[PDB]
RNA sequence: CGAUGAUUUUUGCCCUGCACAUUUUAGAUGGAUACGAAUAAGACUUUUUAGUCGCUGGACCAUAGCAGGCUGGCAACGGUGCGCUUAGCGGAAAGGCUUUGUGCGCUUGCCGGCGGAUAGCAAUGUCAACAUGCGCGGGGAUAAAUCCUUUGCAUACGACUUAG
RNA sequence: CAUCGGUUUGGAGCGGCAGGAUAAUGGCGGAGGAAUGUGGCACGGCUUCUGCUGUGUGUUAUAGCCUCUGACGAUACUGCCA
């Protein structure tokens, strides 16, 4: 229930507008929040209807002069934040503000790449739809609206995911010494107080 | 209705040895293996004997129970495309203009050459998918061989072939002109 | 100690409000680590310091404070109703005030 | 051989101690629905609840027929020395240094913080 | 109601806004797409239009009435002096696009090529790239540090070229500076090509040959304010029009309360970006050549 | 939340008649105000009564002979729909005749719209034998030595953020 | 939004160390604590069907000392802070992640001696990062654009292409 | 800050009394019964019978359950406590 300095999450397998809602919340109540892994996002709904939804969003625009309409992002993160700026009072400064207080990414870059992602467990795909039901990774939808960046973000994702990996088998070696060095301590007078105290 | 357990028995031959984890399903025969992902589905799968393997469905409803039976039937052409493997032989059907079909390797691929189908000056081919085998059989007059391991390849090849010879701006019940799927079996006859 | 804190970390959320007018003479609090109203009934009473920087200074210093105490709890997840001795200012929304451990009732 | 993954679930079956509400101990005594069963046991009433309640443990009090009465699950549950099995597991244990850890007072903490700096002196003299 | 009789539009909506170019100099928007395979090649030459002429050749065109037979028809002469490489860009995909990690200039540059950077050349000191001259300090480690950076990083690379413009009859002395995409082979290649042909001069002989189809990126001509009649070709109103009949009529319904995006409207003509595509190579003439 | 109640009345006795017949009715009500409305409302679809013209007896509550013996109980309906009325029969698995008829009402205000007030209720019975019970829903759970996982456990959190990865083994 | 050239002898500019004073802050007050992937499955020692785990972060790291003083000893030869220093990796917005040697501290790992009062029974009872300015000290460099005339690849005027 | 008085919102609040089928259960004792038939027994497929297992039989055996009941003792629920 802590208040954090800034809270990344890793938007893979989260369902949009949940994850909207809740991040709008977030950040209205004075709370920054980072999102990554918008390509990974998941819309609730098969491929074909989220589609169809999208075309529905680009039907609507200035008769007069396009320029003026609907602005119709394509990029991932903008769905996101056009979805949460739906939820906002963002004509007002307070709005304008708490949008300040977010910021929403593809992939992770720097330098949220070597810092804690979490989830946000009432807005999981996995854990809220039926198993049977089908589902929209925004990265398809995306790259089928406009989108231009889809394979670069694999590229890097996979090179992202190798220094991550040499990390994890670095931090396992340590973790493996350390636990070691702590059986050797065990038995000991303060490894005896702290199994009393329940430690 | 929310059927409580539904199961189905996998009948695994003397050779074979079926390998499952986390719905991936490895199909070891005689005649090779065969791999199938079944991560759209939710069955499980526990082995009862070398020779037997139960595929359950729990607490499913009626269109997730419709695919259990499904699965034991996929699994099952695995067994018998690295058991007995698979053949389609189709026949080549024409009123007025011979079919000149030929077996050719452009690109470094193997293609199907479809030429004078219905006297057209078009040329068609047909990609052959791999692990699909062509062959013109000797036997027989125009008749082609399609075999291999997996079922699904060669009846999908089969149908490119057959549907690029489909008969357009023609009454189709007077020029049943076309390559047609005579006869489906496999390749160790029983 | 690299710790000197004494307060409880609070934000202020809100006014008391409909959905078209807001009731500036009650704030509504959410503590930190408190989910439930049960959590929530240990912090009655505790009065609560807003802490803020003005231009000038008064007596040498430019830290102003405005002082509250706590009256109800709001809700079901833990919020706290309060009341300061002037209404906080709406430009205050999402800022932390300090959450005091007094009137101490352990 | 064929090496086939098969499922590690618990099952639902007579037998199958839960835990409720992190505090009791109970059986399942026989099978209402997909969602409800009647669960007894020493330290609990004998009831009919709802399987979103309760939590099934990986533990089979065994030969319990279906249906059996309180003094029948008593019976067994004593034999089968359920209690000393769910204590000798590491998801009690854990509880177990929950409930010890809130139990602690400051002047325990301030303790608990000294003996902490001490043998962090000692793994780092050993991992050296 | 509708329109009494249906009629295409007057204009295309695909070359909006009819605005002047944002420069005089045709700039590349696209280059064609890299091939490992190809060897290290230019994709493109700056020119100057000097005018048209006009020739005789035979076609060759089977089936056609006038296969073998003499046409005649109109050419564009384009004055091309060699280029001088200068310099060379790397650029790195990024999920926002294409972005230039370092630019890596030449030794020495030539006056005209200089006046470039400059609005007033007769006035100034001429300071410019004087410490990156000095950049070239001994081992000239800074610049093989910064090659070798674009090697490992860079996805495409760009080679900077400038027109000899004082080979040409203009009495304009500032180059013409541009980027011209680098395609085949390795970015190690690229960057090789590039460092060795740093203050080199370049011909179109190395670039086109003779028969192929190339692409043409151009301002158009400046026609100034125009009105709709010539700017879009609208109908004429009547003789005995009141106030005039170089107009459009009706400029948009009562609904929506507003002029259209798609109305045409008096403004500005002419002066535009434009690329032009699939003109075919006659001839690659030679200054030395004397017929 | 339902209680069975036991509601017996008779006619205003008369010098005609001064003892009219005891009739009982089983009730299944949410509380004793509502039980004595329900009585009167069916006794007037059936004898000559009102509530002016007659008296209440006695009003008592029903409870399950075994609360803790698993059941299965089958339940004749007479319900009325958007377009006619229609007689039907469903079957229950509960431990408590009360808790069996909750559980029809939510069921026929589910699968039929019928809502409370559309619902009469014709009598439920607890099912002795195994071959009495018809409805494959409930007979699927007569099985033996039944077993079954639960599988995808959703867990309810406290927190809003959780820094390791969920899970759903059970 | 990026790369790149030159950046004012003007008492004007850049970079940097200290020191100080101010304005600002959508709001410091121990720590944003880094695999990937699946969930009808995972994770650890291992290595894969075995043991153990989850059933929430009520965790992990850090946390004692006048907001943490002045001094002394022991045990270990570790830990940590800062300053130079060696080498390497990181371009997605790398601006960070490591690392060699050295110097200066601290160490609450353990034991001593001395200090805090009167702020009076609470009154935030003032301890942070961003920015700007100014004194000293130190390394470094020493431009352009516009008007005007001119051009006509441009043009209603602005603006634009040229030249001086 | 304390204490008081008025109003008011609470606690994982604590206790006593009353009512009911003078709760129903449960537990103990007794009597009876059946099967989703425990042990045992008879045929089998895989097991050096290594929860082996399948089908029959029948009524506590090497599990138990259901129905009725006899004497106690509780609890849920709803009220009252000046
Ligand atoms: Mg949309
Ligand atoms: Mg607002
Ligand atoms: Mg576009
Ligand atoms: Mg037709
Ligand atoms: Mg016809
Ligand atoms: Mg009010
Ligand atoms: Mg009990
Ligand atoms: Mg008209
Ligand atoms: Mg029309
Ligand atoms: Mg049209
Ligand atoms: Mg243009
Ligand atoms: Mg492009
Ligand atoms: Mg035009
Ligand atoms: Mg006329
Ligand atoms: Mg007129
Ligand atoms: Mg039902
Ligand atoms: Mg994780
Ligand atoms: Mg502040
Ligand atoms: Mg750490
Ligand atoms: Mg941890
Ligand atoms: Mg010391
Ligand atoms: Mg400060
Ligand atoms: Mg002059
Ligand atoms: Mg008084
Ligand atoms: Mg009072
Ligand atoms: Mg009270
Ligand atoms: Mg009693
Ligand atoms: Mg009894
Ligand atoms: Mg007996
Ligand atoms: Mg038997
Ligand atoms: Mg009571």
Known sequence: ???????????????????????????????????????????????????????????????????????????????????????????????????????????????????????????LRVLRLKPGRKYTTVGKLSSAVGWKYESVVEKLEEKRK????????????????????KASTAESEAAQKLAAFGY | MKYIQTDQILDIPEGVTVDIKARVVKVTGPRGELTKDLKHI??????????????????????????????????????????????????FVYAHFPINVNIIKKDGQDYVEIRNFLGEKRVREVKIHEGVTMEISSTQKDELIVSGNSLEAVSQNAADIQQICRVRNKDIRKFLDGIYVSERGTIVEE | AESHRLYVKGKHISYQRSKSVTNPNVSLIQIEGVASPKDAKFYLGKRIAYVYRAPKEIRGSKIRVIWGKVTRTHGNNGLVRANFKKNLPPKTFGASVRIMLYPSNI | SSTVKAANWRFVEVGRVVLVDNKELATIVEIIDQKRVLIDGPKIQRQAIALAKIVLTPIVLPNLPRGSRTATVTKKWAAADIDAKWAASGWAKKLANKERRSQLSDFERFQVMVLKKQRRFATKKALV | ???????????????????????????????????????????????????????????????????????????????????????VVGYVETPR???????????????????????????????????????????????????????????????????????????????????????????????????????????????????????????????????????????????????????????????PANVNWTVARAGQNGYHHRTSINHKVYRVGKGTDEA | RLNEYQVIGRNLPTESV????????????????????????????????????????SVNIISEAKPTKVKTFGIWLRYESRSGIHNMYKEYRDVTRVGAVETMYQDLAARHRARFRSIHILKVVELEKTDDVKRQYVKQ???????????????????????????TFY
């Open chain 1, 1 to 123: 229930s802590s208040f954090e300095k800034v809270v990344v999450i890793d938007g893979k397998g989260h369902l949009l507008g949940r994850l909207a809602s809740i991040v709008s919340k977030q950040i209205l109540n004075g709370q920054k929040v980072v999102v990554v892994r918008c390509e990974e996002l998941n819309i609730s709904g098969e491929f074909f209807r989220n589609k169809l939804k999208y075309h529905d969003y680009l039907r609507k625009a200035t008769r007069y002069n396009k320029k003026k309409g609907p602005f119709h992002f394509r990029a991932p993160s903008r769905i996101l934040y056009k979805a949460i700026r739906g939820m906002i009072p963002h004509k007002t400064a307070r709005g304008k503000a708490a949008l300040e207080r977010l910021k929403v990414f593809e992939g992770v870059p720097p330098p949220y790449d070597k810092k804690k992602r979490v989830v946000v467990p009432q807005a």
């Open chain 6, 18 to 57: 001064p003892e009219p017949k005891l009739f009982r009715m089983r009730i299944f009500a949410p509380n004793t105000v509502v039980a004595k409305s329900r009585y009167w409302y069916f006794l007037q679809k059936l004898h000559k009564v009102k509530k002016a013209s007659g008296e209440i007896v």
């Open chain 2, 42 to 91: 939710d069955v499980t799968f526990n082995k009862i004997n070398n020779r037997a393997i139960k595929i359950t469905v729990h607490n499913g409803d009626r269109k997730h129970v419709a695919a259990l039976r499904t699965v034991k039937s996929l699994i099952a052409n695995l067994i018998t495309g690295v058991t007995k493997g698979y053949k389609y032989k189709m026949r």
């Open chain 5, 1 to 87: 109601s509708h329109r009494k009789y249906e009629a295409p539009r007057h204009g295309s909506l695909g070359f909006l806004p009819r605005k002047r170019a944002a420069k005089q100099r045709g700039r590349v928007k696209s280059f064609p797409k890299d091939v490992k395979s190809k060897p290290v090649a230019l994709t493109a030459f700056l020119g100057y239009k000097a005018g048209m002429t006009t020739i005789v050749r035979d076609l060759d065109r089977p089936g056609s009435k006038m296969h073998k037979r003499e046409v005649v028809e109109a050419a564009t002469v384009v004055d091309t002096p060699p280029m001088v490489v200068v310099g």
């Open chain 5, 97 to 255: 696009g294409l972005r230039s990690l370092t630019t890596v200039w030449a030794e020495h540059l030539s006056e005209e090529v200089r006046r470039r950077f400059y609005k007033n050349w007769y006035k100034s000191k001429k300071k410019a790239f004087t410490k990156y001259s000095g950049k070239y300090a001994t081992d000239a480690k800074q610049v093989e540090t910064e090659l070798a950076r674009i090697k490992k990083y860079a996805s495409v690379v760009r080679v900077l070229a400038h027109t000899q413009i004082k080979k040409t009859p203009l009495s304009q002395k500032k180059a013409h500076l541009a980027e011209i995409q680098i395609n085949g082979g390795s970015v190690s290649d690229k960057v090789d090509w590039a460092k060795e042909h740093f203050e080199k001069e370049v011909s179109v002989d190395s670039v086109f040959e003779q028969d192929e189809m190339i692409d043409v990126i151009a301002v158009t001509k400046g026609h100034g304010f125009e009105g709709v009649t010539h700017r879009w070709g609208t109908k004429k109103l009547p003789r005995k029009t009141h106030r005039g009949l170089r107009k459009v009529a009706c400029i948009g319904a009562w609904h």
């Open chain 6, 141 to 167: 759970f007569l099985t033996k030595d039944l077993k079954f996982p639960l599988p995808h456990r959703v867990q309810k959190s406290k927190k809003l953020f959780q820094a390791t990865a969920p899970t």
């Open chain 1, 162 to 181: 190798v220094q991550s990996a040499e990390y994890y088998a670095k931090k396992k070696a340590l973790t493996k010494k350390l636990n070691a060095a």
